[PDB]
């Protein structure tokens, strides 16, 4: 891995920001690897989460948020266009009303903001991936 | 301009970070446009500056730092491979001992750290450019 995992990146996000994560799963899909990305409100892992994204490669994606320490109503989609054994590009674009999630250039979901994205101060990338790069662009 | 100028971007930098700035000068070189990038230690414009970079397009680059509010000994180079009227890519790479400055893929200088780069909390891009994008990568 070019970068350590879990990877905790301090960030400042605004409307128009894009988080770009490039990496490769460390297991084949028959072994049920996962990728997780959390938009944390502080560096502390127990802080609230504006957007939690967990990919079960070859299966489905689960999303949620944690407010006042409480996980809210989970959201899901079966559209997970990641390829077995290959590098992926995951883009999370901050729109005024939602995070748009793109996988390898394919829009898969829009997760609506329940707190403003400018409250996000750390992005954590975790679980079963080798991380090649992480970029924050505007 | 895709982005407002001056553009003040909160950042967290570490060894291995790269700041990538893409834009175009707003004047032809016969009109002496400038581009400035400052690695500020706070959002406040009067805070100390770990690395100040000022391009006089077609002419030269001046670099400095501001410590305890005092500008230190200025550094310069005549190598400014920006092209008149064209978009440029400026990359500032954080190495353990210096910022390496690349213009359109060409290394032009290494500005040695006098304070650690992790003290940089804001990057300001200013002066005579239309700003297409700014990215911070690791």
PDB file of C-alpha atoms in Angstrom, chain A residues 3 7 9-12 14 20 132-138, chain B residues 3 7 9-12 14 20 132-138:
ATOM      1  CA  UNK A   3      -0.620   4.695   2.242  1.00  0.00           C
ATOM      2  CA  UNK A   7      -5.987   6.163   6.560  1.00  0.00           C
ATOM      3  CA  UNK A   9      -6.989  12.396   6.373  1.00  0.00           C
ATOM      4  CA  UNK A  10      -7.807  15.795   7.888  1.00  0.00           C
ATOM      5  CA  UNK A  11     -10.012  17.641   5.386  1.00  0.00           C
ATOM      6  CA  UNK A  12     -12.036  20.787   4.838  1.00  0.00           C
ATOM      7  CA  UNK A  14     -17.261  22.559   0.792  1.00  0.00           C
ATOM      8  CA  UNK A  20     -10.875  10.766  -5.008  1.00  0.00           C
ATOM      9  CA  UNK A 132      -2.674   4.022  -3.942  1.00  0.00           C
ATOM     10  CA  UNK A 133      -3.724   7.655  -3.526  1.00  0.00           C
ATOM     11  CA  UNK A 134      -6.267   9.942  -1.920  1.00  0.00           C
ATOM     12  CA  UNK A 135      -6.922  13.431  -3.292  1.00  0.00           C
ATOM     13  CA  UNK A 136      -9.215  16.279  -2.280  1.00  0.00           C
ATOM     14  CA  UNK A 137      -9.958  18.654  -5.141  1.00  0.00           C
ATOM     15  CA  UNK A 138     -11.990  21.809  -5.807  1.00  0.00           C
TER      16      UNK A 138
ATOM     17  CA  UNK B   3     -12.711  29.362  -8.284  1.00  0.00           C
ATOM     18  CA  UNK B   7      -8.503  31.414  -3.023  1.00  0.00           C
ATOM     19  CA  UNK B   9      -7.969  26.603   1.034  1.00  0.00           C
ATOM     20  CA  UNK B  10      -7.753  25.034   4.500  1.00  0.00           C
ATOM     21  CA  UNK B  11      -5.221  22.193   4.293  1.00  0.00           C
ATOM     22  CA  UNK B  12      -3.376  19.592   6.324  1.00  0.00           C
ATOM     23  CA  UNK B  14       2.430  16.054   5.563  1.00  0.00           C
ATOM     24  CA  UNK B  20      -1.662  20.875  -7.609  1.00  0.00           C
ATOM     25  CA  UNK B 132      -9.357  26.082 -12.857  1.00  0.00           C
ATOM     26  CA  UNK B 133      -8.701  23.650 -10.005  1.00  0.00           C
ATOM     27  CA  UNK B 134      -6.738  23.123  -6.821  1.00  0.00           C
ATOM     28  CA  UNK B 135      -6.081  19.628  -5.468  1.00  0.00           C
ATOM     29  CA  UNK B 136      -4.279  18.273  -2.415  1.00  0.00           C
ATOM     30  CA  UNK B 137      -3.137  14.684  -2.857  1.00  0.00           C
ATOM     31  CA  UNK B 138      -1.261  12.001  -0.906  1.00  0.00           C
TER      32      UNK B 138
END
